Enzyme design. Structure first.
Site, PDB file in Angstrom:
ATOM      1  N   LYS B  15      -5.600  -5.726   1.483  1.00  0.00           N
ATOM      2  CA  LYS B  15      -6.848  -5.036   1.295  1.00  0.00           C
ATOM      3  C   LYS B  15      -6.687  -3.551   1.654  1.00  0.00           C
ATOM      4  O   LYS B  15      -7.044  -2.700   0.840  1.00  0.00           O
ATOM      5  CB  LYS B  15      -7.881  -5.774   2.164  1.00  0.00           C
ATOM      6  CG  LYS B  15      -9.205  -5.063   2.434  1.00  0.00           C
ATOM      7  CD  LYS B  15     -10.070  -5.838   3.405  1.00  0.00           C
ATOM      8  CE  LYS B  15      -9.369  -6.226   4.708  1.00  0.00           C
ATOM      9  NZ  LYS B  15      -8.777  -5.102   5.414  1.00  0.00           N
ATOM     10  N   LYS B  41      -8.558  -3.883  14.145  1.00  0.00           N
ATOM     11  CA  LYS B  41      -7.285  -3.222  14.203  1.00  0.00           C
ATOM     12  C   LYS B  41      -7.430  -1.890  13.431  1.00  0.00           C
ATOM     13  O   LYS B  41      -8.090  -1.774  12.379  1.00  0.00           O
ATOM     14  CB  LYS B  41      -6.347  -4.255  13.594  1.00  0.00           C
ATOM     15  CG  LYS B  41      -4.937  -4.432  14.139  1.00  0.00           C
ATOM     16  CD  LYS B  41      -3.969  -3.431  13.537  1.00  0.00           C
ATOM     17  CE  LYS B  41      -2.563  -3.772  13.959  1.00  0.00           C
ATOM     18  NZ  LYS B  41      -1.750  -2.590  13.786  1.00  0.00           N
TER      19      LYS B  41
HETATM   20  N1  ADP Z   1       0.714  -4.458  -3.873  1.00  0.00           N
HETATM   21  C1  ADP Z   1       1.432  -4.881  -2.844  1.00  0.00           C
HETATM   22  N2  ADP Z   1       2.678  -5.323  -3.048  1.00  0.00           N
HETATM   23  C2  ADP Z   1       3.375  -5.777  -2.009  1.00  0.00           C
HETATM   24  N3  ADP Z   1       3.031  -5.882  -0.731  1.00  0.00           N
HETATM   25  C3  ADP Z   1       1.777  -5.409  -0.561  1.00  0.00           C
HETATM   26  C4  ADP Z   1       0.946  -4.903  -1.528  1.00  0.00           C
HETATM   27  N4  ADP Z   1      -0.258  -4.498  -0.969  1.00  0.00           N
HETATM   28  C5  ADP Z   1      -0.118  -4.783   0.297  1.00  0.00           C
HETATM   29  N5  ADP Z   1       1.099  -5.330   0.627  1.00  0.00           N
HETATM   30  C6  ADP Z   1       1.627  -5.782   1.948  1.00  0.00           C
HETATM   31  O1  ADP Z   1       0.857  -6.904   2.485  1.00  0.00           O
HETATM   32  C7  ADP Z   1       0.912  -6.772   3.951  1.00  0.00           C
HETATM   33  C8  ADP Z   1      -0.581  -6.595   4.415  1.00  0.00           C
HETATM   34  O2  ADP Z   1      -1.300  -5.506   3.826  1.00  0.00           O
HETATM   35  P1  ADP Z   1      -2.677  -4.967   4.430  1.00  0.00           P
HETATM   36  O3  ADP Z   1      -3.095  -3.982   3.414  1.00  0.00           O
HETATM   37  O4  ADP Z   1      -2.250  -4.388   5.746  1.00  0.00           O
HETATM   38  O5  ADP Z   1      -3.545  -6.171   4.516  1.00  0.00           O
HETATM   39  P2  ADP Z   1      -4.859  -6.192   5.232  1.00  0.00           P
HETATM   40  O6  ADP Z   1      -5.745  -5.016   5.083  1.00  0.00           O
HETATM   41  O7  ADP Z   1      -5.657  -7.360   4.170  1.00  0.00           O
HETATM   42  O8  ADP Z   1      -4.850  -6.789   6.591  1.00  0.00           O
HETATM   43  C9  ADP Z   1       1.900  -5.541   4.216  1.00  0.00           C
HETATM   44  O9  ADP Z   1       3.295  -5.853   3.982  1.00  0.00           O
HETATM   45  C10 ADP Z   1       1.435  -4.689   3.020  1.00  0.00           C
HETATM   46  O10 ADP Z   1       2.354  -3.596   2.860  1.00  0.00           O
HETATM   47 MG    MG Z   2      -6.188  -3.467   7.760  1.00  0.00          MG
END
Ligand code: ADP
Ligand code: MG
Ligand code: ADP
Ligand code: SF4
Ligand code: MG
EC number: 1.18.6.1
Lengths: 289, 289
Positions: B15, B41
């Site tokens: 997200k 977080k």
């Molecule tokens: N399009 C994508 N392709 C590959 N990995 C992704 C992609 N978007 C997010 N990720 C990875 O998924 C994991 C979680 O992403 P994050 O954006 O931090 O999730 P969240 O906000 O839902 O907690 C990390 O490794 C992030 O880099």
């Molecule tokens: Mg986040």
């Protein structure tokens, strides 16, 4: 006699499968135990009851108008090993607090006295993603003395474990809520068993057991069953036995010691899942390196 | 002029990486946009600011005693593309509601008028795991008109997507909150692109874009950067461009139509991620089959 237990942990690390199985393995040693699911989704009691989704107190209290209009036999239902079951229900999406759903179901269970009937154990299946007042309700209202945090060698599950631990810290003073131990549910990421023991010692608790990654689990699940019930002989069943055993034998109920972000991040780098921060390259384009 | 947007979605489906990137790709088309992270977080604004974790309103308001004692320049900070940033803070673990953290930070941003200064877009990064009143705060207090649900071909992300949608349904009447579209963040599970479009049509919205699984993402991340900022030329950057483009061009703001569990489960079976329920074997041991 009876022990008031709750299992916390992040979503999707296998909190309900560890819980339902060790409770079935506990009830294989002939214990009357009750599971109370606090989670929005009704997935917390389904494997004991061979059901798809048990009816929740928020569902049925909508049908009869209020909670007093609910009759216990169709609220709390027993499955394998005479293990009693109640799925409490989530918040009305976008509007209610999760806490309310939990509290009304405790009160309905104290009111119609299933709490004082014979039971050696009660277990609350509680989500550890948000550790807000809502999900901390069994801790605040001193309904869970022994917190067992399920986790794995992955940042967020650890974060969660730590933040659940800060909540035990706040209600140490007001009551008797104390952390039992961590349970590592293998992700098959490399030396995660070591990592979670490091955390367990930095918090002052133990990593009470390391539950492995098994396919057994989803074989049993297609039948809407516990592992203990599908094949009593797989070593997965004896893992849950080793935990179910280790759980009743525990007398380590520490008042944990939460860590820094930085301190947690250490652990992850030190045990190889997180990398190391090269500051040379930070804030610099495809070109600049 | 300005559009009040919010991106919801389950934890760990990406997200914040979809949000921070499309906002960097939106601000590559020269938009002043503001991200407000509502998540416990501080991971929701870090990639724009090249920081590790921005300071939150609950952190700084603890330091100065109250929210009025906070001065805006060190609350809201800008990074790449003059994109403004504020991490609002979580609940005090085990005690607070998440909602409070969000509301105080809206009020501080309306109070010190950064809302009416020049901005074409505002974006709220909001967790969709629990859709309780707390996380539904920007919907309840009519601060987010356009909900964009990130998801993937997996039960829980879908569940989430649907439940966020039930919350849009409740505040349809009271205000102008409406669902924009779903965004599928590829898990590389087989025909998930199709599955999420099925859901989008069953809800009455569109699957506005399918964001792929790229390694590019974590290459940019070791530098604490957006993809748009690391390599402007990778087709991942042009995926986020395709979405950032598609977002401002959208004029489909449906008042969605949520589905049954059973109806959702259909989708999953019909598109192969979930299996089919053989009732022959249910409730039967290693022996009985
Ligand atoms: N399009 C994508 N392709 C590959 N990995 C992704 C992609 N978007 C997010 N990720 C990875 O998924 C994991 C979680 O992403 P994050 O954006 O931090 O999730 P969240 O906000 O839902 O907690 C990390 O490794 C992030 O880099
Ligand atoms: Mg986040
Ligand atoms: N020990 C295990 N080995 C393999 N898969 C597991 C194990 N424990 C749980 N799982 C699987 O992980 C997924 C989520 O489990 P669940 O217990 O439902 O998580 P949760 O309570 O944290 O939401 C399901 O496939 C579940 O069967
Ligand atoms: S306390 Fe927690 S469960 Fe209740 S409304 Fe707040 S964020 Fe949701
Ligand atoms: Mg569950």
């Amino acid at each position: 006699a009876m022990r008031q237990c709750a299992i916390y942990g992040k979503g999707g690390i296998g909190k309900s499968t560890t819980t339902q199985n060790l409770v079935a393995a506990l009830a294989e040693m002939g214990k009357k135990v009750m599971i109370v699911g606090c989670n929005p989704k009704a997935d917390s009691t389904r494997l004991i009851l061979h059901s798809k989704a048990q009816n929740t107190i928020m569902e049925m209290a909508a049908e009869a108008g209020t909670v007093e209009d609910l009759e216990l036999e169709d609220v709390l239902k027993a499955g394998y090993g005479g293990v009693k079951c109640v799925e409490s229900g989530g918040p009305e999406p976008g509007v209610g607090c999760a806490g309310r759903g939990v509290i009304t179901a405790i009160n309905f269970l104290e009111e119609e006295g299933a709490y004082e009937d014979d039971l050696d154990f009660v277990f609350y299946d509680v989500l550890g993603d948000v550790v807000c007042g809502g999900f901390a309700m069994p801790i605040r209202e001193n309904k869970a003395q022994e917190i067992y945090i399920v986790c794995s060698g992955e940042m967020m599950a650890m974060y969660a474990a730590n933040n659940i631990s800060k909540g035990i810290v706040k209600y140490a003073n007001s009551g008797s809520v104390r952390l039992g131990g961590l349970i590592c549910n293998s992700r098959n990421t490399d030396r995660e068993d070591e990592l979670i023991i490091a955390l367990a010692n930095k918090l002052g608790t133990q990593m009470i057991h390391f539950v492995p990654r098994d396919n057994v689990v989803q074989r049993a699940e297609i039948r809407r069953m516990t592992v203990i019930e599908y094949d009593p002989k797989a070593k997965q069943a004896d893992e849950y036995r080793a935990l179910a055993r280790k759980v009743v034998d525990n007398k380590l109920l520490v008042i944990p010691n939460p860590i820094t972000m930085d301190e947690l991040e250490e652990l992850l780098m030190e045990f190889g899942i997180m990398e190391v921060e090269d500051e040379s390259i930070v804030g610099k384009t495809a070109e600049e390196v």
